[PDB]
């Protein structure tokens, strides 16, 4: 359930 890297486009 780990979200994408915070440094990545959201």
């Amino acid at each position, epitope marked *: 359930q*780990a979200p994408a*890297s*915070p*440094a*990545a486009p959201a």
Partner: antibody
Amino acid sequence: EVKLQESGPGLVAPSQSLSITCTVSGFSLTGYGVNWVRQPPGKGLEWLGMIWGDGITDYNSALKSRLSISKDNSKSQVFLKMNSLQTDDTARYYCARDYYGRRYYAMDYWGQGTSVTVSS
Amino acid sequence: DIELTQSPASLAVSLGQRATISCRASKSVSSSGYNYMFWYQQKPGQPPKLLIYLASNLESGVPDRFWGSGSGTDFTLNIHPVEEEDAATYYCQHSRELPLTFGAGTKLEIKR
């Protein structure tokens, strides 16, 4: 069968340009993002930038003014171009796929790399 | 810009004993209860190979002998028992903000 292979000149003169091509197979560039990472001989790893599936392109802020990253989904090619080359841009240049396409901004599959020296 | 300080720069360990490598971040690399921290092994003439993702998860096909731990700004890579084929340079990286940075690496010598 996931593969990536870098290709480029090997030698470039100072203040000139550098063009490298990363050729991929076993996956679509529409779904996975691809990074450029370089390693100066003797030293360690420096992240250059990333081009995601959708086309969003991220650069290392310290070199953004000299870097250009593009791709062609249909030909399975990712491109890097660097201007105003100085001697300490001498390194092995790698392309690495986004780890499992989960967007954790880590790397699973790398190419073997392409060596570049900057000298007249 | 986050810095990662890896220690020690080089390390010698005896076959069958334990190797402990440290990675210290200049800011927390935690978000939503996950630590955006990764470990690679680089042998000569080869590219780096991910062993650990998200601080503590073991990549499939990598032996039980490797494990990562830590959180916030203090992370560790442990090997036990150390084998001959573990002779390599180990690197940490984070993805908390941009740009992505790496540690300067830890070179592991195998004593015999």
